[PDB]
């Protein structure tokens, strides 16, 4: 896998150069894949929404691909991929340690101005999940926020496992093959059940602009982006960085 | 690269430019046929959509809907929301001016609403069952389309040509299948989650205009979605999509 | 743009022509391939269909009817409708005559209709289950389309035309699986939608001809829907896309 | 010259004599894996078919039935019902001969039902649970088959390989993925249209053979089922096939 | 015929048994990561089938289970299941000892078991909802699994490693998205068909052992099931799939 590593490894390169000589364009592209991922939340809710509780794993896993595809194949800077990449370019030595902790925050808080701005877009646009309290944008919300922090790492390192490993088959394969990729492990992490903090923000910023219930709160927001971030961050530095790393010549 | 993408963007740039100075039947024939080709797909949905269940809908008519900018793309045909895409970076570019741009804009908005129009009469003489049969979901989503609030179509317009521009952009940083399936995704993300088409809805409202419509649909209630809609589809083509790609780039 | 596709169907135009000319059995073969192919697709979605609640008979048959272009135009075999854009193209880029494009149409069309002919036959000796039952869709969608007025009739094939020489064009301009795609999708859009396919309703004809049909269904009306399902489809195949495009490119 | 697919066929057609010649393990072999093969399809779809009311059947067993000729074709194998295709064309371009031709065909076909027998009893040690319940589908759509009449079967049979010819056809016009949507379309067409297929038949039988039929079904109706589709899948293989398209060019 | 594929799994073999000796590490990292990977699709698809009908479980269940050797194959790892193949043909071939293919075989296999065991583990303190209600598919499955007879495993192994070799045959003589078709349609037919695979079990397993599972599964029962699929698996692998590949060429 030298070659898959080599490519990651270029590009923390590339995520660095586009930091420290592009800050205008590194700030467009975060906020970019923030809403790109969001555009694909709002499309699972409003299906999940009307249908029956025991579908909507499987229809909202089958259609969340967009989320991805629009990221790796329009182009944007997506944090839980930075996790892996920026591992890989400081273990082959293309950037280093301190720039790669400097550049995962900025790529968060990209992340999520995006993930606001096409809330909020979607909030002036009328958006039908918003104004009614039984909506599953804020029932999932909720029960979101208010789950344990073990739960919620363990769950955000399982689905930055499938969705680094989209990005990783991505890179290794060809035309379509990418778009497969990227459509299977969207589906295993929706539909079971796992945690995507940038996915998050998105359906986090949906509920705080409708119809959500006293117990819904900015603290609660925090609680789970603070647990969902650290263990999609373990999956994508220790599992696939380091995991690869390891596993070649 | 970015760089790769947005020079082809402003090569096609040049080459409406040209279309609509030196060839102008031409212009016409491609205008009117992307409106056309949209239309046949709102056809397509509509038809499905009005079997099935309100909650099924959604996800039938979006996970249908792909061959309207399938047609438009692979078969060839001049698109108004394409453009506000295509044009901005053309005049970034340098390759057109600011000029060229706000001149060519309208003329493939009209163009569409040639074939727009010109699909939905073809059907009517089709006996297509979707017009006589007041009850259709053509007669009721183009009502609720005439009479929503500006603000909100608007941002639906918004978020809806993000979307469709974004398959635009992918289809052209992409090979063979990988178009079709780009196409495919935001078409059903746009159409699923309620945003709004300004050249679809030309063949939606042309559909209950020439059949039996509710007497509280309008021309002006067509006006006014088919304006605040088109403004919308402008603001993600330029900002979001044209100056968005421009400025992210090193 | 569009110069290659075209002078590709003004080539396929004279090599039709040649075949016509100089192997008159290999044309004669090769058409009635095309009907027999169209047939093995039509017996597949009213089989499908013929189970299903009339509420998803368009989705379900729309979505499977997609093998029949797929095996005329991946397996190879003459099919009419596309031949009046080919011809078009043809006559309009000089490869061929006027003269040569009108003796070649009708020649094509009887070709087709042996194989459609053909293909039900074999389908009935075969036992086939569509055709005994009175109560089967075979009977009452044949019966449907034969009458029909001639307006709603010619508009419906102007309409499938437009979709199904689309598919063909789009076929042209890709390669691979993105082939297949563009062919699935135009004739989910036709037979979804209601549209009239000539060559395909051949096969419906004599499949309900051949099984328990009711007694309003009469030769006369097949004729008749014959008559006007052509006419259509022979408009959008010449005009909209054979003389659309010869007008739209540069 | 003959078109490229024409001489594939042939210069297939060769390599079958010189298979068949020069190596008969290894044309022993290779027919027993398309009949397990083609088998393998057949036990995924009864089993599927199995828990759906009969109106979804034919779409579904339809639909799912693909993976029969993908082995066949992609992982490599003899299949009896495409030589009847390849063996008239390469009589027709002198690559091989009458002779050849007849003397090969049966024993693919022999070859054929030993795979075919061979996955029926391993599905049937392993405990399947489509063998003990004579009512069930695959007992009842065995027995229907074995006692249908001559001339139906034929028919049958011959546009069941129409359309797995087409499949072959297409499938050497074409690469990659196109190859298996070609045969997708095809055995969608032909099993949901309720054709005979010689060789899937065998498996059909095998399974319910070995499995508790009611004494109904004999020996004498499986073979008077698989003389009239193998009749009927040669007639459209050697003639509307491999003739039609010899005379086509 | 298949004598490049026969040498490509052969190099494979070779590949594998230069890292097992210069590369503990990675090794176990790589046979990890192929037993967590199957195990991802297990969890995806039992968590799907729970949820539905008995009746459409083995469709859905098989229809989504592509994701596993997806992940083994793209992602690259190392799975025993595959190895069974691999290492048989670089026996034959003469790139690999037999003496090789016994220290590697096992240790493939506990590598699969280590990776399995550790999703699984993940999946509970991840408060996967899987585990705590006794009437969850994941107990009632792993529990039939667990007693049944010997020869009956055994028989179902052999027929699943049949498919899942297919799958990484197929894939090997196939590029791009081929390699995908090929693989989901193995596992629809192997999952919706009822047979074993020895590593996928050992998540299933490790799931309901972690979970709230009844008195009467145990680990002689776990252990039953392994030995016996195992061994079936290994059939196929070595003799359907190695041997018969082999003895299929001039």
Aim: proline share 3%; glycine share 10%.
């Amino acid at each position: 896998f030298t070659d898959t590593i080599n490519k990651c490894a270029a590009n923390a390169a590339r995520i660095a150069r586009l930091s420290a000589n592009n800050p205008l364009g590194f700030w467009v592209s975060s906020a970019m894949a923030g809403a790109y991922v969001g555009l694909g939340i709002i499309l699972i809710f409003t299906l999940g929404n009307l249908l029956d509780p025991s579908v909507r794993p499987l229809v909202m896993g089958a259609t969340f691909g967009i989320a991805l595809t629009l990221v790796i194949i329009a182009g944007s800077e997506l944090f839980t991929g930075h996790t892996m990449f920026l591992t890989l370019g400081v273990k082959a030595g293309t950037i280093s340690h301190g720039q790669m902790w400097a550049i995962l925050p900025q790529t968060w808080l990209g992340n999520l101005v995006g993930s606001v701005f096409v809330a909020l877009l979607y909030s002036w646009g009328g958006g039908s999940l918003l104004p009614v309290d039984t909506s599953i944008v804020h029932s999932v919300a909720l029960a979101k926020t208010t789950a344990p922090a073990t739960v919620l790492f363990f769950k955000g390192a399982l689905c930055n496992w499938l969705v680094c490993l989209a990005i990783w088959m991505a890179i290794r394969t060809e035309g379509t093959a990418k778009f497969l990729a990227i459509w299977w492990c969207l589906l295993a992490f929706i539909a079971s059940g796992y945690e995507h903090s940038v996915a998050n923000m998105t359906l986090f910023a949906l509920s705080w602009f409708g119809h959500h219930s006293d117990a819904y709160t900015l603290a609660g927001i925090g609680h789970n982006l603070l647990w969902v971030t650290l263990g999609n961050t373990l999956s994508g530095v220790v599992f696939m960085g380091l995991g690869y790393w390891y596993a070649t010549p």
